[PDB]
């Protein structure tokens, strides 16, 4: 009668899938405490959902996370989007509905793209210039 759920988050081709289940605390990512994901200048970014929702909601679930793709910063947003997109689907499935409407509005009013992925991806270079829109120098005379 297992009670678990799985949801992902993307940001610029950097996917992070979080799996949340019945438990007590214990939010990990690739096997490390989230205190220790490398670019620690950004730590408050990936503490945002728990620091915003309070550790009373993060009390009955254990949420592991597997990340792969993208760059260093583009994975901080993958993680930061995946775990909060999870605590809102473990509630919506195994709790009442009207309790998850609290989570979703504490969340979406502070910062969107904790539930809605950025649709931005790199544009493709063209002949004539070094990148997508620039062009090489033009020497008239």
């Amino acid at each position: 009668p297992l009670q678990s759920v799985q949801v992902f988050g993307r940001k610029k081709t950097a996917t992070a899938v979080a799996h949340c289940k019945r438990g007590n605390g214990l939010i990990k990512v690739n096997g490390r405490p989230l205190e220790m994901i490398e670019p620690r200048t950004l730590q408050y970014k990936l503490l945002e959902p728990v620091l915003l929702l309070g550790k009373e909601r993060f009390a009955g679930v254990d949420i592991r996370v597997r990340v792969k793709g993208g760059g260093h910063v583009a994975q901080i947003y993958a993680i930061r989007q995946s775990i909060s997109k999870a605590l809102v689907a473990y509630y919506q499935k195994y709790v009442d509905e009207a309790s998850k409407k609290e989570i979703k509005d504490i969340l979406i009013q502070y910062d969107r793209t904790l539930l809605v992925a950025d649709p931005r991806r790199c544009e493709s270079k063209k002949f004539g210039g070094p990148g997508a829109r620039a062009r090489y120098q033009k020497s008239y005379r």
Binding site: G31, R32, P33, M36
Partner: protein
């Protein structure tokens, strides 16, 4: 606590200070007159650089048990500045990576696994996790 529980730099410093506290782990003769890779421009400052390098090598074997010398030289590769031409990615030194893995087999921490490559012995993993707990208890982690 395991190794993934603790900050991966002070763990390295502890492991180096421990490796250079046994008298074992013979170092090569040329330890003080070597550039350490094709792309560097100077010899390492830390007179004990072989101990640190062996420590990090063992840790890296712990996290990915099938390395072999051809990736220790990739794990250690860097960026070469070709004078007046653009830089390019360049590998480590094969010879020191080889002599590091050989020096670890003398401590019975490493052994040549099935297929080909290297992994830590059961007795190596204990030697690691012990100082992992030592670190977690010193810094209170």
């Amino acid at each position: 606590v395991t190794v993934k529980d603790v900050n991966q730099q002070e763990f390295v410093r502890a492991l180096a200070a421990f490796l250079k506290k046994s008298g074992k782990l013979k170092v090569p003769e040329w330890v003080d007159t070597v550039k350490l890779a094709k792309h560097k421009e100077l010899a390492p400052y830390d007179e004990n650089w072989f101990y640190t390098r062996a420590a990090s090598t063992a840790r890296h074997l712990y996290l990915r048990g099938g390395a072999g010398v051809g990736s220790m030289t990739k794990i250690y590769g860097g960026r070469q500045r070709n004078g007046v031409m653009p830089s390019h990615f360049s590998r480590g030194s094969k010879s020191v990576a080889r002599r590091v893995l050989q020096a670890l087999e003398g401590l019975k921490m490493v052994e040549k696994d099935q297929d080909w490559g290297r992994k830590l012995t059961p007795q190596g993993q204990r030697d690691l996790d012990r100082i992992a707990g030592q670190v977690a208890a010193a810094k209170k982690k």
